[PDB]
């Protein structure tokens, strides 16, 4: 997403991947995944309330993060 | 002394 | 909570140790190449120096085995690159540079989470004595400056009783004993009969090229 | 042969000087070389290598940071000519114009 | 805008190629110091270089007093020390 | 060239475990093999 959109909103999550998720000992906790879900939802709403290619990659993102949740809840 | 250990090999080490 | 988080990464108990320097470095090489080849200038100049300087610091933390130092280097670099390349500096070239630097940050984090092993000293290509190894070793020697910089860097950071003259004489004996060992192996796996002329093809190939040059 | 006697002497002198210094200032057996010595010698060498690769390029690129000059016309000469004939109109708009 | 450079001799892709070539040459020069330094260990790691200093200084005394027959016989000793690697490990040993 | 590869790899093991007194004594063996051309024809012979 940050390679395509290249904004300043889509910078928060890549930083947090490299410094909170990948450095967490057992597994990235609930709070990481919930933060990512909440942030991506916000950005969708904010950009909606303001181009013709704004919320396509963010739909994929949100749906991928909710897939993970389902696996990390079945095991 | 360091430099008397570095410079002290003989033919007996390379024996059997 | 911040204190607690950090403690964990630095002093846990679930640390199966691994060595991913070889590869962390290959990503850095590939990056270097992208910057240089796709130079299309002060920007390029400064960035080239940056990449070079990160590589030097990386070697230091490997040879001195510090996990706290690697954590700090990661934090700094992640923030810095994500700011410089997304605010200051501004493109397929820069899009790649980023993907390849993202792979570096991932592999680095694996090392800060897993811990350094016990035996970190010893070349990567001098472990197996085949034919691929010989050709890669010899190729690495041809790149101008690599062999020398490795030697001096390893001296400064490893604890030794010898000087630099003597360090570099131990490293030369080893390079040449390796190359002889590789050739001795190939001639045991593929022997040649006693009194058999070298085949014409080999001769005409090698000789031919030289004459043409 | 003269020059081979003179070379043996030069190198035997240099070894003799170094053997002396290491008798006047001995070093204990099994003592790591001090970090300062290492960082000094090594540091310089590393720096030289960077300055034999990057610095040349940098200086050439510094030369390239220059300017261009506004060469405004001194005279703007304009003519209107019908066919082969003498120009109907000629004017030279100089500096003030 | 017109353009008049002062140091415009450093221009062109020929100058880029020149730079590369310089690096290569300097590279080979530096390799010199780090490459075959193991081939001269026999003549540069001598433990006690005192008995050789006496031969070298006696060739010089003989040249002063012009007794040139002994310059030849002392040159023969110096040349047969450097022609037998194992008589240099006897002459250059620490006599303690 | 196998017996020399063992000396070169033992200098490296000692550097790892920081037993620096044996780095000096094993450097002395490597330097006195390369200073006597005839002890290299004994150390580097095919032991068959
Ligand atoms: C078993 C081999 C089969 C796998 C194939 C992958 C190897 C790829 C081909 C290798 C030969 C090509 C050399 C590329 C770099 C070496 C990678 C490697 O072998 O990986 C090496 C890294 O080499 C180095 O240590 C070099 C570090 C010093 C250089 C730092 C300053 C950089 C100087 C300028 C760099 C700019 C660009 C660099 C190269 C430019 C173009 C080549 C592994 O550290 P090592 O043996 O201590 O390890 C210890 C135990 N693992
Ligand atoms: C000196 C001023 C004269 C002007 C000429 C300018 C050229 C100076 C050096 C430029 C490099 C020219 C290469 C010469 C070719 C011989 C290589 C050599 O070691 O030749 C050496 C010197 O000679 C020797 O050491 C004798 C050993 C001969 C070994 C023959 C083959 C060894 C490696 C060849 C590769 C074999 C297969 C590898 C497969 C993959 C390789 C990618 C010159 O290289 P270099 O090392 O100091 O390279 C590093 C910086 N350029």
Numbering used by the authors:
A (entry chain A): 1698 to 1747, 1779 to 1803
B (entry chain A): 1408 to 1423
C (entry chain A): 1941 to 1980, 2001 to 2050, 2060 to 2182
D (entry chain B): 2135 to 2231
E (entry chain B): 2426 to 2521
F (entry chain A): 2474 to 2521
What does the paper say about this structure?
The purified hPIEZO1 protein was subjected to the standard cryo-EM workflow, resulting in a cryo-EM density map at a total resolution of 3.3 Å from approximately 87K particles that allowed us to build a near-atomic model of hPIEZO1. The rest of the THUs, along with the pore module consisting of an anchor, an outer helix (OH), an IH, and a cap domain, are resolved. The hPIEZO1 density map, filtered with a low-pass filter, shows a disk approximately 30 nm wide with a horn-like density in the peripheral blade region, likely due to the PTMs such as glycosylation. Structural comparison of hPIEZO1 and curved mPIEZO1 shows that hPIEZO1 presents a more flattened structure from the side view. The blades of hPIEZO1 are about 5 Å down toward the cytoplasmic side than those of mPIEZO1. Therefore, hPIEZO1 appears more extended than the curved mPIEZO1. The pore radius of hPIEZO1 is between that of the curved and flattened mPIEZO1. Therefore, the curved hPIEZO1 may still represent a nonconducting state, and the differences in curvature and pore radius may be implicated in channel gating properties of hPIEZO1 and mPIEZO1. We also carefully checked the corresponding pore lipid configuration in the 3.3 Å resolution map of hPIEZO1 and the 3.8 Å resolution map of hPIEZO1-A1988V without the multi-lipidated MDFIC auxiliary subunit and found that in wild-type hPIEZO1, similar pore lipids also insert into the hydrophobic pore interacting with R2456. Our high-resolution structures support a model in which the pore lipids directly seal the central hydrophobic pore and involve fast inactivation of hPIEZO1.
